[PDB]
């Protein structure tokens, strides 16, 4: 039918229930286990708290929340439709996914910037920064994330397509809504920052020798590891979004039969953004000699 005017078709596919739910459940279980164990270690098993641990704590919290709010979408796919829960726990879940993902990206970028300043500028005041200022920075970052995500809360996110109710935010429409702009923006700029910081770290550490200790050699690979993990986890979604925008521009919003395959591929690739939440403890939390 229609979704707040702006004639644009939405699609429902039965292919999702065939493939996604098992893989998504496995990802949820792995992420929940990793996040819970990491939180258990950090909250009580450790006493020395620094700026790096503070900045990692918020990333762990965001990953834990994103893993927690996932069975709600498990229900959305196993039942295939109707969003039985209601209306408020649709805006709520579409808020708590976007906010969690944006927080994860922001805290990954902050960790990378902290490492870059620790390696390239060893004698800087930012390296010796009090826990109080770290808490202020964390609160400000969380506030920015919530302020950018709250746009979806003061609206209506229901469609009621015939006998099926869909709880969706990515609606294929000829519009330049803030959601699509944010989805495009929160990838390239953090990608550039991470690549620049990683390249500077590698170059400055390599020209300065320091290869005999071999723990420097152990740690010089994890930077590129996390860079490529971020790249592979967040490239396909933005690629598919760009292709969808190009198709929408070159074919309009009519003839709602070509969008089927690209929408299916988009929903396939949107599950990649949940893959990083289970690898994050592996390559960021248990990958350090500290514990």
């Amino acid at each position: 039918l229609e979704i707040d005017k702006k004639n644009c078709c939405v699609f429902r596919d039965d292919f999702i229930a065939k493939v996604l739910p098992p893989v998504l459940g496995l990802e949820f279980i792995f992420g929940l286990l990793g996040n819970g164990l990491a939180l258990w270690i950090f909250c009580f098993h450790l006493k020395s708290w620094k700026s790096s641990r503070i900045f990692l704590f918020n990333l762990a919290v965001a990953d834990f929340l994103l893993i927690i709010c996932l069975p709600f979408v498990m229900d959305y796919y196993v039942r295939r439709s109707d969003w039985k829960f209601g209306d408020i726990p649709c805006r709520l879940v579409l808020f708590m996914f976007a906010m969690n993902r944006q927080g994860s990206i922001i805290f990954l970028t902050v960790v990378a910037v902290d490492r870059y300043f620790r390696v390239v500028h060893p004698h800087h005041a930012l390296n010796k920064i009090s826990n109080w200022t770290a808490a202020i920075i964390s609160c400000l970052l969380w506030g920015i994330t919530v302020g950018l995500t709250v746009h979806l809360l003061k609206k209506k996110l229901l469609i009621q397509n015939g006998t099926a109710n869909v709880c969706i935010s990515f609606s294929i429409c000829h519009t330049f809504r803030w959601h699509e702009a944010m989805f495009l923006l929160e990838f390239f700029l953090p990608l550039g920052i991470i690549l620049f910081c990683s390249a500077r770290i590698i170059w400055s550490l390599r020209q300065r020798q320091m290869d005999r200790h071999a723990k420097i050699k152990r740690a010089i690979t994890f930077i590129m590891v996390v860079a490529i993990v971020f790249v592979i986890c967040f490239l396909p979604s933005v690629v598919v979004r760009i292709h969808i925008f190009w198709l929408l521009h070159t074919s309009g919003t009519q003839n709602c039969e070509v969008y089927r395959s690209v929408d299916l591929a988009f929903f396939i690739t949107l599950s990649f953004t949940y893959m990083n939440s289970m690898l994050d403890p592996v390559v960021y939390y248990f990958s350090s000699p500290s514990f």
């Binding site: 490492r115 004698h123 390296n127 200790h213």
Partner: protein, 228 residues
């Protein structure tokens, strides 16, 4: 606060001002680099300090280079037991050790048979393998190479090291001495030893100290963040 009297309020504000001063002093003192200077009587510590700076007890030298404030502590005057006060220096950025490599044939004034170089090696072995300096970097300075070049032509190194098997060229002898000193390091995993060959006119030792300190601080930062 609400129930406190005037005298209690005065005491509380005095305590708060004292706390503010203590915190600012600690923050100011946490940005400096602390170095412990060691050696022997004629190792050449004073010669190094001559270009570094540009009642018995402990004498402290403060110098600035590239916007870093350094602080060297010379403890050569303390002739008491070393084990009773060596734990006060646990937590220094690095240890600077001075060795006169031109004294391979000279002998100690106190005891004739014992060589000076062997005594220096024993002192280095004691310091390097100390339990309070498990992961503290050591900067090794070999001082009198100008006299070493002249004395190695007319004398063989086999006097100090009877197991030496090589030519009496200056480069080979200096390399052999460097490997003899660096072989005493029994950790090789927690600490790094930096060796430099200097003279009375090298005038570039402060840059070497700065580079070693920068490497140590980078390693400390990486250990703190989680890597390394």
């Amino acid at each position: 606060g609400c129930t406190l009297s005037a005298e209690d309020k005065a005491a509380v504000e005095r305590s708060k001002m004292i706390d503010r001063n203590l915190r600012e002093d600690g923050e100011k003192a946490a940005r400096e680099v602390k170095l412990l200077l060691l050696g022997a009587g004629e190792s050449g510590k004073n010669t190094i300090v001559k270009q570094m700076k540009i009642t018995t007890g402990i004498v402290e030298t403060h110098f600035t280079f590239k916007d870093l404030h350094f602080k060297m502590f010379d403890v050569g005057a303390q002739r008491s037991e070393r084990k009773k006060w060596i734990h006060c220096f646990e937590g220094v950025t690095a240890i600077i050790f001075c060795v006169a490599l031109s004294d391979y044939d000279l002998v100690l004034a106190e005891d004739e048979e014992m060589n000076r170089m062997h005594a220096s090696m024993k002192l280095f072995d004691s310091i390097c393998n100390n339990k309070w300096f498990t992961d503290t970097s050591i900067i090794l300075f070999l001082n009198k190479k100008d006299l070493f070049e002249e004395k190695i032509k007319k004398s063989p190194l086999t006097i100090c090291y009877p197991e030496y098997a090589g030519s009496n060229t200056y480069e080979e002898a200096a390399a052999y001495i460097q490997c003899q000193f660096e072989d005493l390091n029994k950790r090789k995993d927690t600490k790094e030893i930096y060796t430099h060959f200097t003279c009375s006119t090298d005038t570039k030792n402060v840059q070497f100290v700065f580079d070693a300190v920068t490497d140590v601080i980078i390693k400390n930062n990486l250990k703190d963040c989680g890597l390394f």
